[PDB]
Amino acid sequence: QAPIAAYKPRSNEILWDGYGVPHIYGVDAPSAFYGYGWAQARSHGDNILRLYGEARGKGAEYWGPDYEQTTVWLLTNGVPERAQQWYAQQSPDFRANLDAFAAGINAYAQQNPDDISPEVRQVLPVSGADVVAHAHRLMNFLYVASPGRTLGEGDPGANSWAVAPGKTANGNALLLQNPHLSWTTDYFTYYEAHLVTPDFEIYGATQIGLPVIRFAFNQRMGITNTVNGMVGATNYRLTLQDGGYLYDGQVRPFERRQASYRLRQADGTTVDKPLEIRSSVHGPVFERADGTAVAVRVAGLDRPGMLEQYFDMITADSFDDYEAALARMQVPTFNIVYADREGTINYSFNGVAPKRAEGDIAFWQGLVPGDSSRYLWTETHPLDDLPRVTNPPGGFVQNSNDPPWTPTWPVTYTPKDFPSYLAPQTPHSLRAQQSVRLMSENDDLTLERFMALQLSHRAVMADRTLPDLIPAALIDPDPEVQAAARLLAAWDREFTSDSRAALLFEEWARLFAGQNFAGQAGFATPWSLDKPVSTPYGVRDPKAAVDQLRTAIANTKRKYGAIDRPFGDASRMILNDVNVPGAAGYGNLGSFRVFTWSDPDENGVRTPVHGETWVAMIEFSTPVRAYGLMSYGNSRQPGTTHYSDQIERVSRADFRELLLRREQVEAAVQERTPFNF
Template sequence: MVQFTNRQVLKWMYWVLIISIVISSHCKVKAQKATIRWDQWGIPHIEAKWTKDLYYGLGWAQMKAHGNVILKLYAKARGKSAEYWGGQENVQSDVKIWRLNIPARSKTWYDLQTTEMKEYINAFVSGMNAYTRKYSHLIHPENEAVLPILNTDLLSHLQLSYHVGVGAFALNQQSTSWENAGSNAWAIGPRKSASGNTMLLIQPHPPWMENHRFFEAHLTDDKTNLYGIMQLGSPSMAMGFNENLGWGMTFNQADSFDLIELELQNGKYKLEGNWTGLEISPASIKIKEGNSFLDSTVQIKKSAYGYLVSEKNGRALALRLSGLDRPFMMQQLMEMGRATNVAGFEKALSKLQLPLQNIILADKKGSIGYVYNGIIPQRPSGNLGQWSQIIPSSRPGALVHSYHSYGELPKIIDPQSGFVANSNNSPWTSTYPPALEEKDYPPYFAFSNFDLRARKSLKMLLSKDRLTFDDLLEFQGSTKSELAEIVLGELIAFAEQSKDQDLKSAAKVLSQWDKKLDPKSKGAILFIEWYLLVSGDSMFTKEFPWANLEGFPDGLTTSAKKKLAQAAKQTKEKYGSLDVTFDSVFKTQLKDKVLGGALGLNEVGCFSAGFYRPGPEHKKFLVGGTAFSSVIEFGSRLRAKGLLSYGNFTEDPPFEPTDQFEILLKRRLRDVYFYPKEIRENTKLKELLITE
């Protein structure tokens, strides 16, 4: 038998310990994993021990679902789309992006992030790049030049898609055709809830375009159990919920941008009466033409009022954007998602990194809230309408020196009504009876807007003393026209008494209509034709405020009623009959499929609403509207249903997700899988990622 001395044993134990440490360290690196379980709807449930690994998995998942779209978005945000693909439209895009100094600011923003946020950004980008390396054959050849993705790309994309695309939405060339874009959000407190649990409805209505498209995901680590939606290319949850709290957003009128007219002279502009030099710096861009490149220079011109975006005849327009000096939106959104109650959420929100949007929230403890969020300039006088015009630089207040604090913004926390609700209406009407007085706030904070959709929203909420989860499921998909509820009886009575046969036929169709804009609804098209004829005129004998929920207009004008005959004639000429179904006219195109039926219309007071562009043969094609809907109840066990209308993939999916659009047409929601057992039972694909 071999004998060992004490010295030999100690030496042997020493080397065993060293080897064990090395192996353990090596295994620890390789054991840091993110697990992605894709459910039947195409939703990734991403789980990791550490947050950085969670972000790695999120980057991987977004590229799997939308890789080529994201590369195009990032290329555009870099200001290099003309370099990669050429074309005058891309040149114009690059010039705009450089004039606003977005690429350079993104580098500054990245450097200012905390060590923690840099780690998460880097992990998200690493996950994206790892996916493109492993599945390089799925990247379109024309997009390969965009690779690798940079850690500043998502910050450039954030500025372009949010600060410019949302904050300065009205500057978009297509904004006039999107004027009915909007959103709905409700929070129901214990006073209004049949179960005593708080409930939340989230329903944004953005354009269905790549830079406004949502990605639905579920994120779980040692600090987070968060479900919701984010913009493509962003790692930050924009709206969603955890086990204790949730929030939604709707577009508001916070003054998040200005266009200021400047006087120019020899590279100088007038600043409060004095000629002052512009800050001018050049930026080089490349423009692809065939197999060669042209070099061009963009002059970045900055004034104290903002960046110059247009010059003509000794004048210039400077664009001020709220939030360009506040680089911590991602940090704030992460803290909002980790909050467990309204007070903690408000602490995160009070950092005011988001330039605008109403915030509606609810927590498990029974609190609900509404915040008219915005980075709003302090003005000496004037109302929002006046400050929404092109502003002469000589006007007092045109040069912004300071912004309102979080404490000065309109808020409603736990109102007596038991609910808060917003459908892009003003803060003063975001519960009923009102809990805020407009006179208590500066007149430049908000418009006093309240339309038919907002009226429909409040009327549904007030239709019952207490609401159930199933009530919210029914209400969220409603396309019943509030305008039809108000005028249809009078319109039918007028038509029935007429000797005009077209009017009598119209009366018969409208009397059988269910007042909905659902796919097989008959009468909706005739009613819409009538509305389009009267909408530019005075419809009622006396002007009526829609916010008066207790009353009704005095009546339709004779002219408005008579136009039903013209509407009937036009409907027959365009579509062949008066009782044409809604889905035979209103269409939705998803990829290469054209589907009948879609969403209701904001103009006639539908809650779940969309907006459309004209197509051939008098058809209308959906371009935006209800993109995501979710109803959540915060009980002892969280209960939720949801729907991402257009699905979670633009790439070819590795399996065939269940079609969500068909559920949208039925005005329903599908299951949301939040707990481990239900996630495992509904997993269609599991991926185990080893991070490096």
């Protein structure tokens, strides 16, 4: 009936387990935030300090030319100054938590100066405003309005499942947390932690430097997030004329402010660099390589409560409380999925979306005319205007970065129900089609079965194409093409370690469906929302596709040494001196569990660039039962034993039991940090 009795910490302490996960106990909220800051500094201090330095707009000053582009970007968009504003605009209670978090980082560094890399020592001390600034950059100027997409590190994404009681064997909701981000990008690094005070408990993962857990659960509830690409910014093409810009048939002068920054020189000194910031009514103005003047208008710059919103969301006493916090509209993007012990599940297409009178998403993603107030939006949508699903007939919600049109099955709304600028109406990826299949087709789910389904690694692309490709390839006069066809034909279409056909198939699909495997032109039957998990299908031009196979055979041998090298011989997961066989692969090929394999080296060996990072599955029984892994461990500091210590388990899908109960934590403790606050 009621959840298990909450633990009431009588002292401030961190209990670290055998994988470097901190269990932070505080007698009050600031105490726990302090412990969390301390813990993050221990595990990720160097990169956190670096990022905080950048978010100050001082990257160029501290570290020179390599950081100057980011400095200019952040200064032009007024990030460091707005962060100071947002910090002052915090509620007193929450500001005290932010101060405590920063104080924890400072205290860790003070007590352990040998653990802080020389280059980032100059960043200390950090402040609550620093914490706010990094979160502001991450959300508004990386996830919403980025200065340009980074290449070769996968596409930010995730899977998410929530399953209602009626669909389970035991009658308890199930939740999957499963974000896909780069394994190397510092600000994308996830960190696992556990916070306990007399008033709340939170367990889960969050990006380093964030003082609140975004992928959180406890004894009552849990959430997860996926990328929805909410269009929270507009790029306006300006018409430059007579020193100003043409707007409503009139020349308007720019707003101008003379900023400047320091740039570190090779000799350790700094040079003062002037920076002229020009702004139109739309926002700050950028000049592009081709000479186009672009004003960037970012929505939700007046929303200082994003950290507190997540905090109130994840500590919510009820779904009603959760929804009230979510409805604040302080979190500018993301699909957010919710489940609780009471049995409620929810999907929300969340973010800060401008209200617009015309134009579809494609129009608002391109360069919008900057010469007219016709296109100058000023208001944003409330939560009630956005796609949301609660306790649907199908008994599950899902999102694998597909447009929000099949979040459950049967669907509860259609694209026509919402303005055309909220989300694309493009073909759902094969991973996303698998996501819907795996949930909808299975009943009476156990946590064990739920976890088994998460490991799915089907080459769905092969299901859609091999029936047509194989017989066409068999009639080719080239005996090697014939042999390749028989190899592909015998394959069980799974991305397993022992698969001898999978690498060849990938190489073919690179041509058939483009380098990202998202191309649609080669299918015989196009994608349809009427058949959302069984289209597109077939090979439109078999003769052409066999020529692609011919080329793919050459490419496979060049990259890997043969057409039949075992998938898990080429695909390895390597961290420090741990080297284990890979399985699963590209989401766009249909693999639900994702490893975006790198290009191979000269030996044909490739490793994940992106994919499974933090993976957790929770059953909201009483007490809750949860399992998880972090691909790249819980620390990235030099000399840590907690970087490469989980990847072998990942290779066998051998998940850790996540320990929330005090007695479990006490049994597992390997290190103790008593602290004073």
